[PDB]
């Protein structure tokens, strides 16, 4: 459950380390983000050598939440600490070549094939 002003943990080594969601995309008057929705975020802190630095405003997609995604039977795969994978504005295509931590099967939507095919688990 990610609404605005939520601090996240950067899953990819694009350069960011701590980001904040400025607005949930995918509909009007939307409450919060979730599973694998697209969100427009800002970076609150980046590493000195990353591709991106502090102050940028670009898209992202959640991969791990503490709210947890629900399997079709009643199983949840809750995690510890919210995460996201950075993406370019116009092109979905992520920025980080490596992904730290697991992702979930619900993220598979062909545009995130690049992401799941760069996952260390699940």
């Amino acid at each position: 459950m990610i609404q605005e002003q939520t601090m996240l943990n950067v899953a990819d080594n694009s350069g960011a380390r701590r980001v904040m969601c400025i607005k949930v995309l995918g509909g009007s008057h939307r409450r919060y983000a979730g599973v694998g929705d697209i969100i427009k975020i800002t970076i609150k802190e980046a590493i000195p050598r990353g591709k991106v630095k502090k102050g940028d405003v670009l898209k992202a997609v959640v991969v791990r939440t503490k709210k947890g995604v629900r399997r079709p039977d009643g199983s949840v795969i809750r995690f510890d600490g919210n995460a996201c994978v950075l993406l370019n504005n116009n092109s979905e295509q992520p920025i980080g070549t490596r992904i730290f931590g697991p992702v979930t099967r619900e993220l598979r939507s062909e545009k995130f094939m690049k992401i799941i095919s760069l996952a260390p688990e699940v």
Partner: protein, 114 residues
Amino acid sequence: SNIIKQLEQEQMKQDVPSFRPGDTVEVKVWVVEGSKKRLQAFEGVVIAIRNRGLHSAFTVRKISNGEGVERVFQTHSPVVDSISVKRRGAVRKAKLYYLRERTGKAARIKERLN
């Protein structure tokens, strides 16, 4: 109810290996990948067990690469192939929710070995 209880016991799987909360449990779960019904594994520590007959469930906490995963499981589900206990853990408290904040050597528990 004579009806509700009847509708449950006919759907409950007969062989569920018993285990107290805290054991190192490995669970093989059926996973569906497009056109393949693969059987991926999941081994971790049980931190909670809910007994509700047919609606019974249990949780398993695995400290994966980087950050930890807390995955629950439906006991009487067709998705849960097998359940195997590795290390019979010894704790004297029902739910190990004090373990969600412990890490490293602080998280480890005692073996039963009675």
